[PDB]
Design a protein around this ligand. Structure first.
Ligand SMILES: Nc1ncnc2c1ncn2[C@@H]1O[C@H](COP(=O)(O)OP(=O)(O)NP(=O)(O)O)[C@@H](O)[C@H]1O
Ligand SMILES: Nc1ncnc2c1ncn2[C@@H]1O[C@H](COP(=O)(O)OP(=O)(O)NP(=O)(O)O)[C@@H](O)[C@H]1O
Ligand SMILES: [Mn+2]
Ligand SMILES: [Mn+2]
Ligand SMILES: [Mn+2]
Ligand SMILES: [Mn+2]
Lengths: 302, 302
């Protein structure tokens, strides 16, 4: 596998990409900043600029840098913290089209992306920025960066973002949910796992009484969802899932009560947000369903 | 004059336009919201919808409504306060291409606009929004609304915004400044006025020692300028002026000390921001000059 071959390009690349930035001084982000893409050549020899290596000659494309500085900033991600947990610490792979890696400290996920998807996102940024500065408590992904790598002719685009479910809290039940049902059962292979990543039906069978929620916690979530859904819909986006991580216990997550009655810290966040039909009311449709489901069935009041 | 003929269309129009909105419920603003433009027919009879009148049949175009709701909101402009001081209180005209009106309470200015200009601005919005949510203390105009009126075939576009120099503080000296000089003297006609609106040279002759500024006040202004200039520049914008209103005294404005030495509350804000070359470095040029001027010559430290 060209796996650890790539794992390198990333860590060498970012590190240079970000150290690069911390020279250039702070300045508000501008509509222009979004469309930019800065590339950097990595000779296996190494220039007096691009040095080190023994890995596999590649270019390292960095995307909309000033924006992702801004976003990190706004998501409170100190760069050395970023650079560190991300570049000086082996990226551990992951089974789940779409290859996921993880920070050695379970902080950060990396996805790859269909070039269609990167390009979409490039466009999304402004829309993101807006939401971000308005629903401070939105559920959408926290995109810390977008970058691409060149394996000879082959091109790999990737996005770095918040692992929603850090090891730090041991999650008991884990559902990926959609408000849909066809194939929405966790395949056999998946269920042979510790805490496995279930799905709509699994949740419907295994939990039909609900996730109970102290009135005012339900509310926030609900509106906050309905806001995200209104955004997402606006970009003709589909296939998004609410990833939920329930934790029975006997400080980052949401409080809840059980079918039985244990106190619960629950963790959630919408994902898989880059496939957009960029029919006319279809995305509108998939948003209301997601809503009515999560807000009526998955979570419920008192 | 079709003046008071127009003064009506505005006050009848907005009022309907805004009352209209306060039905539709709150929701975050979205990239789409900017491009929208809602029109409303005003028969001199009046529908059961558009009623009243005896003034002159017209349509009332409203621009990017949800954004200007959002902006007002963010500039802290309660609508009834808006609607009131603006619609239920005679708009007083003003001598100064470009017709200015004023709120009966000196809160709000109205300009007209070259359709080129409206169209530019329509595009600017996103860029505005960004700046706005980052330089909270920016100097750019506070655009409370954009609207247009139809006089038969004739079309009038207008923008409502913050009077920078309310009667509430009596301004002694008043300069419109640019960091340029050709014709930058206040014409004779102008000087025959109470406090008149001077200009670069007038300021250079009448005040050459400066406007003195307690270190940390100078700083903010300076960066805040340099931010605005970096925005403005990005939109290939030109002819903008820093409007200054100095007030000798013996709570909204800036503190300062004199050539002599009186305490001073100074009021400022960049204007005339809609003419953009939308040469290649020219706007960049006009920004640095504006900067170096206001920051070296017009204001200076200690
Ligand atoms: N931010 C995240 N935090 C934790 N786990 C994640 C995150 N993103 C993805 N995953 C895991 O990977 C699964 C989702 O992959 P997904 O993001 O839906 O990409 P995909 O490959 O397009 N799958 P599909 O829904 O068929 O399109 C989830 O069920 C999670 O368990
Ligand atoms: N927000 C404001 N507050 C107070 N006065 C204003 C404001 N905007 C404009 N004015 C007054 O009107 C003058 C500027 O008109 P301006 O906005 O420059 O439009 P213009 O008609 O394009 N003039 P020009 O600079 O030749 O293009 C200023 O010197 C002010 O005295
Ligand atoms: Mn998915
Ligand atoms: Mn997907
Ligand atoms: Mn001007
Ligand atoms: Mn002008």
């Amino acid at each position: 596998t060209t796996s650890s071959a790539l794992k390198g390009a990333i860590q060498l690349g970012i590190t240079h990409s970000v150290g690069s930035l911390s020279q250039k001084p702070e300045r508000d982000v501008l509509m222009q900043d979004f469309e930019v893409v800065e590339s950097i050549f990595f000779p296996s020899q190494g220039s007096s600029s691009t040095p080190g290596h023994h890995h596999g000659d590649f270019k390292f494309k960095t995307y909309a840098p000033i924006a992702f500085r801004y976003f990190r900033e706004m998501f409170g991600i100190r760069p050395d913290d970023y650079l560190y947990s991300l570049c000086n610490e082996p990226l551990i792979e992951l089974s789940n089209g779409s290859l996921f890696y993880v920070s050695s400290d379970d902080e950060f996920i990396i996805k790859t992306v269909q070039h269609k998807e990167a390009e979409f996102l490039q466009t999304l940024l402004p829309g993101y920025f807006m939401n971000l500065n308005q629903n401070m408590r939105t559920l959408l992904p926290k995109f810390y960066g977008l970058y691409c790598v060149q394996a000879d002719g082959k091109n790999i685009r990737i996005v770095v973002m918040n692992n929603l479910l850090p090891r730090a809290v041991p999650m008991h039940l884990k559902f990926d949910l959609k408000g849909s049902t066809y194939k929405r059962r966790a395949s056999p292979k998946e269920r042979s796992k510790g805490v496995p990543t279930y799905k709509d039906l699994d949740f419907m069978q295994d939990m039909p009484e609900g996730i109970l929620l102290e009135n005012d916690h339900y509310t926030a979530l609900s509106r906050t969802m309905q806001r995200d859904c209104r955004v997402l819909q606006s970009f003709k986006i589909m296939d998004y899932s609410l990833l939920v991580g329930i934790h029975i216990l006997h400080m980052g997550g949401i409080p809840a009560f059980n079918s039985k009655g244990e106190r619960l810290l629950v963790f959630i966040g919408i994902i898989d947000i880059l496939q957009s039909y960029r029919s006319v009311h279809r995305p509108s449709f998939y948003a209301d369903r997601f809503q009515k489901f999560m807000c009526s069935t998955v979570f419920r009041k008192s």
